[PDB]
Amino acid sequence: ASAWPEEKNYHQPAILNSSALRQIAEGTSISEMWQNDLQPLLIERYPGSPGSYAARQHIMQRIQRLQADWVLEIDTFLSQTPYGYRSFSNIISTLNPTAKRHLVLACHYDSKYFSHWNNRVFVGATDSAVPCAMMLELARALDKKLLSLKPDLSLQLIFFDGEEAFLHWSPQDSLYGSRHLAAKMASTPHPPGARGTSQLHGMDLLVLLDLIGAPNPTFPNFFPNSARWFERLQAIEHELHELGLLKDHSLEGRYFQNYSYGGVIQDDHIPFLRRGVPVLHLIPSPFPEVWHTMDDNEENLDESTIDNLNKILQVFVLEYLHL
Amino acid sequence: ASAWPEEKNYHQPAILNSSALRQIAEGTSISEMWQNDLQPLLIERYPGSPGSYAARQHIMQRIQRLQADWVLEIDTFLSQTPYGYRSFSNIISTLNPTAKRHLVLACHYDSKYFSHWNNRVFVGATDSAVPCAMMLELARALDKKLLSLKPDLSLQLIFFDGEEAFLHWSPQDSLYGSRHLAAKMASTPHPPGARGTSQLHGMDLLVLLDLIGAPNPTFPNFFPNSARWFERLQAIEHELHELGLLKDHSLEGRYFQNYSYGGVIQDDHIPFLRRGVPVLHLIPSPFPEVWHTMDDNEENLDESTIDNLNKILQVFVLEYLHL
Amino acid sequence: ASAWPEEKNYHQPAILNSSALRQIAEGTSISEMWQNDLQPLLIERYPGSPGSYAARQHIMQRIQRLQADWVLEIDTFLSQTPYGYRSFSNIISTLNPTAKRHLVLACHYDSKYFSHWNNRVFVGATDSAVPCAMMLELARALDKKLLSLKPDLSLQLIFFDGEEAFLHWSPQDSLYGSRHLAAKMASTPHPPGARGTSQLHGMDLLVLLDLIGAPNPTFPNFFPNSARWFERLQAIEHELHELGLLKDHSLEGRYFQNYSYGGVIQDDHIPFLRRGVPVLHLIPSPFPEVWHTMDDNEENLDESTIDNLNKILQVFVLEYLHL
Amino acid sequence: ASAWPEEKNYHQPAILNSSALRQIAEGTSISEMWQNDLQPLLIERYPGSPGSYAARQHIMQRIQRLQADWVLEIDTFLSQTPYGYRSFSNIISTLNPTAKRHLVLACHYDSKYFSHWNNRVFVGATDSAVPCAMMLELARALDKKLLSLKPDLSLQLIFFDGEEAFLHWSPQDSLYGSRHLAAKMASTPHPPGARGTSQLHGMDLLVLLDLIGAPNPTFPNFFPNSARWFERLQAIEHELHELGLLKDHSLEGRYFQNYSYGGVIQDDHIPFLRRGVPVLHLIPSPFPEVWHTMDDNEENLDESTIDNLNKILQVFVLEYLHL
Amino acid sequence: ASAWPEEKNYHQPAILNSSALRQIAEGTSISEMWQNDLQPLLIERYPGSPGSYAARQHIMQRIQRLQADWVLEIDTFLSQTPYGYRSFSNIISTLNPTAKRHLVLACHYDSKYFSHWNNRVFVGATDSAVPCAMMLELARALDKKLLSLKPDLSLQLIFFDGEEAFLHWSPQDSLYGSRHLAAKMASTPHPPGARGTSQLHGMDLLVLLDLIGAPNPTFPNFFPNSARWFERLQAIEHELHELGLLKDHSLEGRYFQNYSYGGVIQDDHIPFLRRGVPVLHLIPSPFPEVWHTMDDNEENLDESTIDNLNKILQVFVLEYLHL
Amino acid sequence: ASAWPEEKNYHQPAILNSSALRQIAEGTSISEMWQNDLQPLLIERYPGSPGSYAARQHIMQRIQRLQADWVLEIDTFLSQTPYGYRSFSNIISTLNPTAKRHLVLACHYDSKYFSHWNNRVFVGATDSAVPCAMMLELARALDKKLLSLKPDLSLQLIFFDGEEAFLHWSPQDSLYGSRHLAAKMASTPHPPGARGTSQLHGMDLLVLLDLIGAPNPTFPNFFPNSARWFERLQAIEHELHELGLLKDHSLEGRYFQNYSYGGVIQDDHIPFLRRGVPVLHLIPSPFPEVWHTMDDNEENLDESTIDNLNKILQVFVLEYLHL
Numbered sequence A, B, C, D, E, F: 001a002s003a004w005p006e007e008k009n010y011h012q013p014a015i016l017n018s019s020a021l022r023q024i025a026e027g028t029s030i031s032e033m034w035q036n037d038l039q040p041l042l043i044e045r046y047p048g049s050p051g052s053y054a055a056r057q058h059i060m061q062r063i064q065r066l067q068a069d070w071v072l073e074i075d076t077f078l079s080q081t082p083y084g085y086r087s088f089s090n091i092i093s094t095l096n097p098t099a100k101r102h103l104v105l106a107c108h109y110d111s112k113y114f115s116h117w118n119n120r121v122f123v124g125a126t127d128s129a130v131p132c133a134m135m136l137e138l139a140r141a142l143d144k145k146l147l148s149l150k151p152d153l154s155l156q157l158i159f160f161d162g163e164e165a166f167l168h169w170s171p172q173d174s175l176y177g178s179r180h181l182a183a184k185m186a187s188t189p190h191p192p193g194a195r196g197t198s199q200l201h202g203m204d205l206l207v208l209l210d211l212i213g214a215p216n217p218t219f220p221n222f223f224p225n226s227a228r229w230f231e232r233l234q235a236i237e238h239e240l241h242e243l244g245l246l247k248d249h250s251l252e253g254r255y256f257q258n259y260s261y262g263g264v265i266q267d268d269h270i271p272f273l274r275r276g277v278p279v280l281h282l283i284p285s286p287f288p289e290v291w292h293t294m295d296d297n298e299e300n301l302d303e304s305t306i307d308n309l310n311k312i313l314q315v316f317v318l319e320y321l322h323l
């Protein structure tokens, strides 16, 4: 076989040190994200709606304005759903695509479909507009540090379409945009010209964000193939706490508790899991109280904890990429 | 699509108030149930046995003697099992079947098959004769309040046959009566003449009872699509406690702890789950100590906690139906 | 097992004799059928269309006007299709349903869906309005002889809905009304109270008619489990020829040639085949020239050969039922 | 739905007339094809071999030298086989890809893998190097007539890789390059921006060539969804015969006999069939005598009948495209 | 891979010559077989019956009395059927099992189960007691010639149990003894110690006999992977005819007509086919007139054609083994 | 059905008493095991490697030197994997195989395959060489007590091959040696001559050991069909603690906590679970810190806790067998 597609089982982080942490924390503006990155996404955006187009556009526009050589690829495809065949459009933003190994961050940008009620619309603030914004802010706050990319490894952002079901959650009505990109990736030579290494083999770890934005989340540690990376999150959250770099945060209310989760949760990682991609599944258990109700809006987001998680994740990424 | 089959995502309860609670509690006789409803069911009743006929008869007889317009329907069908094709008979008791939306309570009335041992027979007192009786007592205690039904919503009772395996638990040997009614329902126009709304779309929530009757149960909160309804149970159990309306009950031993359950349990809800029916799964974890042994009899039932749960469930129902 | 559900492997016909043949032939009016039974069905009648309702009504109305105790049952159900869940309605007309054994005749009354072209509509005259009419005329011509039913065996007519695909022929888009009645039957005790005999076990033979009405058909002999019954058709066609009871008919152009067919054809019999129901599949090979074009209309039907087949089938039925 | 993806059920040919036939026949050089198009392909070319690269290159080179705006696309992908994951490369040559409707010709360019025997190699002259060449010659002979394309319909050539099994014929070891392009096509918006029309909907008819080059072939008529197009082939073969435009040809030995084929043959059309693409399957029954032996070489090809079929197919194409 | 498991694609026969044919024909006694080999098998012998034991015993006893080093192996196993799990017992008789390559002859020795009718029992003379006897006589007539085995190739006899369905033909109720030996073989190192060659790889060709014993059979040529071997049968039948070595035989009624069979027949070869074992399927099309009726007895066998086929098959075997 | 294959639902232990415990504890030498049983297994031993042969040999050699009538059976088979078909070899050591009921202990002796890194090899000390040794020591320490076997019940050891995936964990790449022995067992008459009792029916309980050897394990209680047996382990661990028979052990750090595990873990028990075999799954949750890294070696094993578990398991076995 090829030498490099093992490089990840042994990859270790460049732990940052207090001077570094203080700057990463300095370099994220929850307020900037909240008005520049997230408020434009708090619209109805089910697949095929005009809001899917708006959101797609907004995401690329806010990436393009950055300096790093982000290579965007809209992957409009078709797939079968209750109401017939329909058009979806995953958004993929990659740095150094030539490269063999990528750390991937991901969420879904579609919003579940709901019939208007009481003249209220479902905009899906935790599920999953915040995660979209968190990934945009991360691309910004770290634009400079991420210029340094031109260890052959880099960063990819995936914003899946069609995470949600049109009707009722089932394996056949769900994960439209993930089930499709898993397969396409699984079947693409990587690097170009290989003859045994697919594009998953370059997927070092899939950090999937989902249902984030409520207060007092608890994130379980879901899979052992990635639990060492979960512990970094705990550590990163601890040190960021003892430096006074977090807001309204308590160690008695940490976000990353070493509580293991035997059971399963269906989500855009399965298509990549079952094919043995290592996964960090940053979805909370229990889900936000407002889950799948019209009350999942901006008013019920907690600024402080989106800010704390932003700071943690950005460190985790610089630490994974050695930056 | 049709307007009404969303009515349940937004349905909220008519919380009862202390004068109301005191009467619901006054209006259940654990002793009446135990001699009139449950003792006749503590017989061997595997599918096709004479005890299946006895139990079927007993259930209808005890319903018919009530005043509300309970419409009974025995749904004798056939399905394949290890030992060949066999005859099963789900029992379905419905109020206002014309109506579009139903809250459904359910258990299984078959008893697992066991070869007599030491001249002892398996009668399955927790699994699941008690749940049968709990649903009969609920129909009685609330007969009057349930006359008021002639918000288009009502109550259905399902007593599945063939929950248990004949040989060894497997997806192919199990859930005979549920796998069959799920499908039949899924394919029945509701309301009559519709052209897109099946009979599940009228299944507002499936409250499935199973393995109840032992002391000191703990019921986990299994699915988020129904966790708000689980919290009502906690609340209802709390208020009923602080009013002195419970027996031998301790808040340090509540039955409904906010302990989440990642993994899965196979049971008559799966056929209705996988098709996206919201489920409250009132089965305890851990299972009774006597589970699937000849020691699951009447002597090892705890009167007090069947009484406490009876009282809680009846409130939950009046609260769900606004009565 | 039960004794009787073998009765069919050994069932033999009461061959009719020239005086009898001459009367059956006397007793069918191709002209009556063509104006009373078939012309009302030459309308667009895809599932859910108003023409499905018209056709459904017309079929029952023309049965009800007969004397025999035809027991009609409309079996409106729901099932999943490309464009979503939809409503279908099989029509079932039975004589002596109490009885254990039935010879079943069947076709499909839906018409394939097509977008109007050149202001032309698909009415599906061979596929399958003629077979519908042929089964109505058979019920009429033999009304008297079929009064004699009150060997426990009788006659059933099935007119399936949703034979055709909405989009493109596939196992998932096809046979909506057959796949559903096969299963329901397979799971229904027969006789009522049995405990091992489904309702297929009473399905002695399924004579399925399809794509009939063109000139010069050739019907292959498809399955050995029913080839003895195919030979009766040949014989019945021969004797009816040598008696001068056929029109524009030639033995060098017989309809039932002992030409075997190795391959397979998908059609409403599969759901009943794969469950081991014996099948006579009266569909021609090759299909009419006009198959699935707007040219499959009334002008391109051949009166003479619909008349010849009508006469043959009616004999076959009286011969199978001993009448 | 969209109007145009029905355009094919009603599409009819522009029959050519004797002056036209004489020129198409004049315009094909069996000798040119045999030295310029086919002899370079009579090499071992299993997937991944150097001969796969040679053949791939040769095919594109011989297309590029033409005048029409052939748009080539090599679709290197990966898929699982007995011996592991491996790299395949379908070749796709399209004219007017912008357009909505395409008539597609196709064969496979891989050669079955065989361990050298007696110092002999399998080069697969009928299976399927000849069909490759026949499609190249067709692109040449008709280059001029095919310039006229800039009824929105055009022509596509597909040369699948991995038709053959590596080990033993099975659904899991076969059709690597077809099973993959069917799916990718099925999921691609066509035209770009559509939201219900895949790229199959533009696949008007799939004319698949395979196992051609032996003498005295007989081609059955496999599917009714395309039998009208098979009859054109018969007609085209007849008229070309009665004009003296064929060599060593006899009507008592026609190639296209109205002999129907009930059973099935597995081949690159299945992936496109099961998804309802209309298919003309030009594979003979029986297969060449030399099938899958080292004797399937150039010495055992019959020039005359490759020439006759070349002439017929080219007419069929001009007739389908109205040229 | 290993060199030898290709040896069969290129294996060719040692055609016998008139002096040889005359002796093979001299050396078979239809009368001996009919009283010594077949009459003991004309008993009810469904799986688990006492007749299965009788037949099993009879088969081994009649082999053991021979001189060649026949190594018998009864492969009693269990598998699931309608009426539950049941015990089957394939019989396997092998010469030179150490060896890598085997020509395999096979039939099934179970008889379909039928409830006695008119005090008549199903003994399955063509289906398949005759084929059993034909394989025993072949072992005898050629005992001497088959001593010569101690080209590493030899002969195996398989008599499957449970070919027939207990209830109704289906993929789940059928081929119990074949589906099981296919798998076991597929997973057994051959030769012992190999690490890639299963025991199928030593299965050079599977000659499966079934439904033989009626007059005027016609055997189609089913698969091209074995059609060269079918032609040997034609040839062998021709030469044996023109030598006056056949009885009541006519070339206008040959048994092996070059009539191809597109469709499929389910039978003990499928388990070995789908895994790419080359198959000669000696079952007639059409099936005997008496197929699956109580009339499939000894009185309706035709001595002459069992004798003619015996002679042909024995030649085919000596010709395949070079003896 | 047969009487005895229920004997296990009611089987209860012969609890040992302090004099007995002290001797079992006296009779295990962690030091002997560690040099005689385990150190020879700390080699690279993926399937087909020379180390698989070494380990296979070592296991049998160390059994054969014992006195009890251990009947060894190497079950070399073949099965499909990413890189092709490959050869595996389960090791099975049985006492009193004639007998109907067996308590089975098991682990896997293969080691996951890894490409050498930093000149380091994966030897899989917890996963699962220690469990191998623990089962050998158990056979030794109890050799004498296990002579007493000549309640028809005995002990079986299974050392599966191919537990691990070659590439990435999936249902298709995993459990090669278990998926194969489950099936073979499921289909073997037991006792020999039975006709309904497979060899699973003699599998009283499957105690599967895996990932053992690290400090401070926590073993959850996975299935209720075996939770009574898990409680024995707790009890046995408690009493062994309060007798001073354990080392470096704390009740605040017990190994068997009554912590239930809702979710699932894939492992050699599934093939036997899904077929309803009762399972005690002694794998810890969480997995060792060194899981699937080169750091899972001998240096990071904790002598004390392997010793404590050895002592506990040996008691559990004598207690299950009444010795």
Ligand SMILES: Nc1no[n+]([O-])c1C(=O)NCCc1c[nH]cn1
Pocket (backbone or CB within 6 Å): A127, A169, A210, A211, A265, A266, A267, B223, B224, B225
């Ligand atoms: N349980 C569920 N019942 O319904 N759903 O959807 C469920 C679910 O688990 N969804 C996955 C998590 C999620 C939802 N939205 C975003 N992520």
Ligand SMILES: Nc1no[n+]([O-])c1C(=O)NCCc1c[nH]cn1
Pocket (backbone or CB within 6 Å): B127, B169, B210, B211, B265, B266, B267, F223, F224, F225
């Ligand atoms: N685990 C199991 N192993 O076996 N079974 O049955 C199991 C099981 O989970 N059954 C479902 C719960 C139940 C049993 N009786 C009523 N409800």
Ligand SMILES: Nc1no[n+]([O-])c1C(=O)NCCc1c[nH]cn1
Pocket (backbone or CB within 6 Å): C127, C169, C210, C211, C265, C266, C267, D223, D224, D225
């Ligand atoms: N081939 C086909 N390709 O498309 N279809 O539908 C096909 C087909 O075989 N249909 C079954 C026969 C039939 C059609 N209409 C009524 N009976």
Ligand SMILES: Nc1no[n+]([O-])c1C(=O)NCCc1c[nH]cn1
Pocket (backbone or CB within 6 Å): D127, D169, D210, D211, D265, D266, D267, E223, E224, E225
């Ligand atoms: N039967 C077969 N047994 O093996 N195979 O491959 C078979 C087969 O049918 N292959 C499909 C036709 C073909 C072969 N080469 C090109 N086209």
Ligand SMILES: Nc1no[n+]([O-])c1C(=O)NCCc1c[nH]cn1
Pocket (backbone or CB within 6 Å): C223, C224, C225, E127, E169, E210, E211, E265, E266, E267
């Ligand atoms: N068609 C059938 N319908 O029912 N069956 O069994 C059928 C069948 O094809 N059986 C296979 C051939 C056979 C039967 N007996 C021995 N060989």
Ligand SMILES: Nc1no[n+]([O-])c1C(=O)NCCc1c[nH]cn1
Pocket (backbone or CB within 6 Å): A223, A224, A225, F127, F169, F210, F211, F265, F266, F267
């Ligand atoms: N999760 C996993 N992700 O990858 N694997 O293998 C996983 C796993 O669960 N393996 C089963 C436990 C095991 C491993 N080695 C021995 N037992």
Ligand SMILES: [Zn+2]
Pocket (backbone or CB within 6 Å): A112, A127, A164, A292
């Ligand atoms: Zn959501």
Ligand SMILES: [Zn+2]
Pocket (backbone or CB within 6 Å): B112, B127, B164, B292
């Ligand atoms: Zn139970």
Ligand SMILES: [Zn+2]
Pocket (backbone or CB within 6 Å): C112, C127, C164, C292
């Ligand atoms: Zn049609």
Ligand SMILES: [Zn+2]
Pocket (backbone or CB within 6 Å): D112, D127, D164, D292
């Ligand atoms: Zn080929």
Ligand SMILES: [Zn+2]
Pocket (backbone or CB within 6 Å): E112, E127, E164, E292
């Ligand atoms: Zn048979």
Ligand SMILES: [Zn+2]
Pocket (backbone or CB within 6 Å): F112, F127, F164, F292
């Ligand atoms: Zn492992």
